[PDB]
Write a protein that binds this DNA or RNA. Sequence first.
RNA 1: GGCUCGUGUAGCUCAUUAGCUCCGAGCC
Length: 14
Amino acid sequence: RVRTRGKRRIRVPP
RNA sequence: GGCUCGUGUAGCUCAUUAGCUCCGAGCC
């Protein structure tokens, strides 16, 4: 998954 | 905890778009 920061990106597993 | 999400009524940032901590939630 990816919290897709409101602007950046944060991958966390799938 | 195993699987999935959310930036996250979680935040910080470096830089990396990431990487630091955690959750909270849903299912079995």
